[PDB]
Amino acid sequence: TSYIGGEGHNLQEHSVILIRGGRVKDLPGVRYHTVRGALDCSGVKDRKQARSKYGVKRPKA
Amino acid sequence: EKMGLALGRLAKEDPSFRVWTDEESNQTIIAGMGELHLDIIVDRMKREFNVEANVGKPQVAYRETIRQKVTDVEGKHAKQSGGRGQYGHVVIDMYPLEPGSNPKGYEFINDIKGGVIPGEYIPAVDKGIQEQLKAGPLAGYPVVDMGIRLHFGSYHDVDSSELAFKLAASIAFKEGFKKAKPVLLEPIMKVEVETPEENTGDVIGDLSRRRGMLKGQESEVTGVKIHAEVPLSEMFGYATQLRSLTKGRASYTMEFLKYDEAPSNVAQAVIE
Amino acid sequence: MKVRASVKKLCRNCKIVKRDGVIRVICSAEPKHKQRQG
Amino acid sequence: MLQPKRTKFRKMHKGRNRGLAQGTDVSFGSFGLKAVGRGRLTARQIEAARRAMTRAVKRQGKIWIRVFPDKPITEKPLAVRMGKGKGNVEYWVALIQPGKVLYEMDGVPEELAREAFKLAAAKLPIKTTFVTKTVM
Amino acid sequence: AKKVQAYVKLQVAAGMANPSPPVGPALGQQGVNIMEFCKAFNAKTDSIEKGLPIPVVITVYADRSFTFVTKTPP
RNA sequence: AGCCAGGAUGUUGGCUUAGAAGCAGCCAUCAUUUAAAGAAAGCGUAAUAGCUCACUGGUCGAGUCGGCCUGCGCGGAAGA
RNA sequence: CGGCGAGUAGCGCAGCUUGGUAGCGCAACUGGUUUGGGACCAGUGGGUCGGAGGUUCGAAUCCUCUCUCGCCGACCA
């Protein structure tokens, strides 16, 4: 399994996404955080802070 | 896996061919242009990549709505049986709102005179229904048009808990739902068609076969701008059954209008 | 062709013929009416 | 359909039918459907072939049965050895004595009148015809 | 005084200019597309009342010209 | 009965404004010019147009037409 | 396809022989008791007897005709 850290995603049953390690310490077994904004995932929006993660490309403004 | 991308390779190479996703049914769309366009794609996949797929047919949404009133039917729940019980009484009135202006399907307000439901629970009891509405019982597909007026209720000091109010509400809804005897709605698509001049008598006659109705049409240079309301269900691969008539001279556009009545025989294809 | 046990004109353009003792009905504007065995 | 309400006996003797009619002619309305045959009209037919008439008289006029079953019929079930009691009341009939006016009707004129009975007579086993109410 | 040449016995709409919707194609089977409809008709309608049901016999000739056998509210 | 000419005007005669032009269908079933022509018996129409009959005059030139009750017949009627 | 024997308050069960009143107890409910719940202690509502139709002064009742559902055996070549 894998956790999708974000405020609303769209990923569902297909389109291989990159996966990386990291336990959540919140769900027994969930030990891998999803790669957001990568291979087949569109990363979250509404965010600019710490956008290096969550795949949020640079704000124009 | 290897399949979906295998088409994306050929979904960029042919700018007329597209590949959507059946969000509401989690599947895929081959967006071609005719018998041949669809054919070779299958075989181009078939041998060039040695990956077999089965042609199918699109899906629909099938959302529901009630057609009558409900009186007050309750939903009280008390899972006490020792410990911290789950208590909550919900007696409500759900109604057939119009499919009109207002955006979302249902509608909810309170009607508890004495505040007999204390504060916090309302949004709480509600959320389960806010959740409940992602799918309807009548089919297993979402619903719209809930004119719910919360009549009354009743609880317990330190036992009546939100879990109960999310829970107890649902039961009130199920019973309430059966007392308003709803029915399915299917996607009705606004569709226009251009017809030479002469095969119009066949295109108009065609829509009658497909349940559509005569709702405006005007003539032009070498065509006519036809309009009808037809459910998307009766639109599988229109062009084939279309071109075959007008020497393939017609040109149509499909824009969604609004859901509407699903008839008797249509209502039970819901079978599963 | 309609072999109805009781033939009769379904129109005006229909006709009544007595071929072979057999009762035959012939229509020129709608072949569907064509029937014998009356 | 037509059925006697709470009569006196479950079962009735067969009984012959020899004899002319006595419910002679057009009493109520203007036209009638007089029968020429001699046959056990069943309860089913009377109704089945009655709505089979009202459709052609859309909503105008007045339709009148001059008959009523009041006659049980006793038919045995399958594979039942002869005897072992009397049968079961499977359905009801209304005997017809040649000459009986079945369906008097009034309202709509002669033309459409000739029709309603035309369709109706088709669904009845007895050969019938048309009659008109005359002075005396 | 003729028979069906290209001509019509339709639309009563004088003042609600460009009478496209209800009638435009009712005679547009033979191609009386909305454009040519009222420009010469209204240039002739400029004698009597608008906002009324003015029937008109659309006598479009074999050379696309036309003068009318129109009528007043029947 | 054929063979001939007409069968037109107001009038798309309303509505359900979905298109319903004599003719989907429901209501009305008017009157002109009238020898007559139904705001209509039928085929047509996306819906008009189209093509006939109702009814009326030319020639023609002898009887002819429509219902009803009975006689005797035909079909319905395919087995090793 | 007959044949005995039930069907009675939400539920499971008395009253039925011999015709004159509808009960046993649990459930729902009310309060008491505990901080609260479980249990417990005293009270209330709650069916008019599957249904139609007869006979009776009176029909849950005794029956006939329909129905509803359990069990019995539907056989010998």
* Resolution of the experimental model, in Å, one decimal: 3.5
Report which secondary-structure segment, H or E, holds B11: helix B2-13
* Distance in angstroms (rounded) separating the CA atoms of residues C16 and C36: 10
Separation in Å: F79 C1' and B84 CA: 85
* Upper half-sphere CA count for residue B116 (Cβ side, 13 Å): 15
Residue D94 in any domain: the answer is: yes
The sign one gets for the Cα dihedral B207, B208, B211, B212 is positive
Report which secondary-structure segment, H or E, holds B246: helix B238-246
Residue D121 in any domain: the answer is: yes
Sheet holding B87-93, edge to edge: B77-78, B87-93, B147-154, B107-110
Parallel, antiparallel, or unpaired for β B224-231 and B213-219? Answer: antiparallel
Residue D6 in any domain: the answer is: no
* Distance in angstroms (rounded) separating the CA atoms of residues B182 and B105: 14
Cβ contact (<8 Å) for E33 and B217?
Answer: no
The strand pairing partners of E66, in sequence order, are E60
* Distance in angstroms (rounded) separating the CA atoms of residues B189 and B177: 28
Interface test with E, best of B194, B214, B217, B218 (most E CBs within 10 A): B218
Query: Which domains, ranges and CATH numbers included, belong to chain E?
Result: 1-71 (3.30.1550.10)
* Distance in angstroms (rounded) separating the CA atoms of residues B212 and D55: 30
For chain B, say whether E22 makes contact (Cβ under 8 Å): no
Q: Please give the structure tokens belonging to residue B179.
A: 């007392």
| D132 Cβ nearer than 7 Å to chain F strand | no
* Distance in angstroms (rounded) separating the CA atoms of residues A14 and B227: 38
Q: Please give the structure tokens belonging to residue B227.
A: 């309009």
Q: Which residues contact E20 (CB under 8 A, 6 or more apart)?
A: B218, E34, E37
Closest CA to B233 of B45, B11, B57: B57
Cβ contact (<8 Å) for A12 and B26?
Answer: yes
* Distance in angstroms (rounded) separating the CA atoms of residues D70 and D27: 21
Separation in Å: G74 C1' and D10 CA: 29
Cβ contact (<8 Å) for B26 and A15?
Answer: no
Asked if B19 contacts B7 with a C-beta cutoff of 8 angstroms, the reply is yes
Nearest-CA residue of chain A relative to B5?
A: A15
Interface test with A, best of B2, B20, B21 (most A CBs within 10 A): B21
Residue D10 in any domain: the answer is: no
Give the other-Cβ count within 10 Å of B103's Cβ.
4
Residue D16 in any domain: the answer is: no
Residue whose entry in the numeric block shows the structure tokens 């029947």: E74
Q: What 3-state class would DSSP assign to C7?
A: coil
| C16 Cβ nearer than 7 Å to chain F strand | no
Helices (H), B55-120: none
Asked if B132 contacts B139 with a C-beta cutoff of 8 angstroms, the reply is no
* Upper half-sphere CA count for residue B185 (Cβ side, 13 Å): 21
| E58 Cβ nearer than 7 Å to chain F strand | no
Asked if C7 contacts C25 with a C-beta cutoff of 8 angstroms, the reply is yes
Cβ contact (<8 Å) for B219 and E24?
Answer: yes
Give the nucleotide nearest to E57 (CA→C1'). Answer: F12
For chain B, say whether A12 makes contact (Cβ under 8 Å): yes
In chain B, residues 197 through 256 whose Cβ sits under 7 angstroms from any atom of nucleic acid strand F: 200-201, 204-205, 213-217, 219
C neighbours by CB contacts (3+ pairs under 8 Å)? none
Q: CA torsion angle for B202, B205, B210, B216 (degrees, to 10)?
A: 100
| E28 Cβ nearer than 7 Å to chain F strand | yes
Q: How far is B51 from chain A (nearest CA, A)?
A: 17
| D83 Cβ nearer than 7 Å to chain G strand | no
- The DSSP line for D42-94 is EHHHHHHHHHHHHGGGTT-SEEEE------EEEE--TT--S-SS--EEEEEEE
The strand pairing partners of B258, in sequence order, are B188
* Distance in angstroms (rounded) separating the CA atoms of residues A34 and D7: 83
| D5 Cβ nearer than 7 Å to chain G strand | no
Asked if D113 contacts D38 with a C-beta cutoff of 8 angstroms, the reply is no
How long a stretch of residues is chain D? 136
* Upper half-sphere CA count for residue B162 (Cβ side, 13 Å): 9
Q: How many domains does chain D have?
A: 1
Residue D4 in any domain: the answer is: no
Give the other-Cβ count within 10 Å of B214's Cβ.
12
* Distance in angstroms (rounded) separating the CA atoms of residues B269 and B7: 32
* Distance in angstroms (rounded) separating the CA atoms of residues E23 and B84: 74
Parallel, antiparallel, or unpaired for β B251-261 and B183-194? Answer: antiparallel
Query: In Å, how far from its chain's centre is CA B50?
Result: 36
Q: What 3-state class would DSSP assign to B68?
A: coil
Closest CA to B61 of B260, B210, B252: B260
* Distance in angstroms (rounded) separating the CA atoms of residues B32 and B42: 11
Cβ contact (<8 Å) for B218 and E31?
Answer: no
A neighbours by CB contacts (3+ pairs under 8 Å)? B
Residue D86 in any domain: the answer is: yes
* Distance in angstroms (rounded) separating the CA atoms of residues B116 and E15: 64
* Distance in angstroms (rounded) separating the CA atoms of residues B107 and B93: 11
Asked if D134 contacts D37 with a C-beta cutoff of 8 angstroms, the reply is no
Asked if D81 contacts D5 with a C-beta cutoff of 8 angstroms, the reply is no
Closest CA to B233 of B19, B22, B59, B35: B59
Asked if B210 contacts B202 with a C-beta cutoff of 8 angstroms, the reply is no
Question: Exposure pattern of B48-86 as b/e (b: 16+ CB <10 Å)?
Answer: eeeeeeeeeeeeeebbbbbeeebeebbbbbbbeeeeebb
| B79 Cβ nearer than 7 Å to chain G strand | no
Q: Which residues in chain A touch residue B26, judged by CB atoms under 8 angstroms apart? A: 12-14
| D86 Cβ nearer than 7 Å to chain G strand | no
* Distance in angstroms (rounded) separating the CA atoms of residues E22 and B217: 9
What does the DSSP 8-state code read for residue E32?
Answer: -
* Domain extent for D104: 21-136
Q: Which residues contact B161 (CB under 8 A, 6 or more apart)?
A: B84, B85, B86, B87, B88
| D10 Cβ nearer than 7 Å to chain G strand | yes
Q: Which residues contact D133 (CB under 8 A, 6 or more apart)?
A: D25, D26, D27, D29, D30, D31, D32
The sign one gets for the Cα dihedral D39, D41, D46, D49 is negative
Q: CA torsion angle for D125, D130, D133, D134 (degrees, to 10)?
A: -130
The strand pairing partners of D103, in sequence order, are D65
* Distance in angstroms (rounded) separating the CA atoms of residues B32 and B29: 9
Parallel, antiparallel, or unpaired for β D31-35 and D128-132? Answer: antiparallel
Q: Do chains A and E touch (3 or more CB pairs under 8 A)?
A: no
Can you give the CATH number for the domain in which D124 is found? Answer: 3.90.1170.10
In chain B, residues 80 through 139 whose Cβ sits under 7 angstroms from any atom of nucleic acid strand G: 80-83, 85
* Upper half-sphere CA count for residue B71 (Cβ side, 13 Å): 3
Asked if B225 contacts B194 with a C-beta cutoff of 8 angstroms, the reply is yes
How long a stretch of residues is chain C? 38
Cβ contact (<8 Å) for B219 and E29?
Answer: yes
Report which secondary-structure segment, H or E, holds D34: strand D31-35
What does the DSSP 8-state code read for residue B247?
Answer: T
Q: What 3-state class would DSSP assign to B171?
A: helix
The sign one gets for the Cα dihedral E43, E49, E51, E55 is negative
* Distance in angstroms (rounded) separating the CA atoms of residues E4 and D133: 55
Residue nearest to nucleotide F10 (CA to C1'): E74
Interface test with B, best of E10, E23, E29, E35 (most B CBs within 10 A): E29
Task: Judge residue C27's burial from the number of C-beta atoms within 10 Å of its C-beta, 0-12 exposed, 13-18 middle, 19 or more buried.
Answer: middle
Separation in Å: G52 C1' and D6 CA: 10
What does the DSSP 8-state code read for residue D118?
Answer: H
The strand pairing partners of B74, in sequence order, are B91
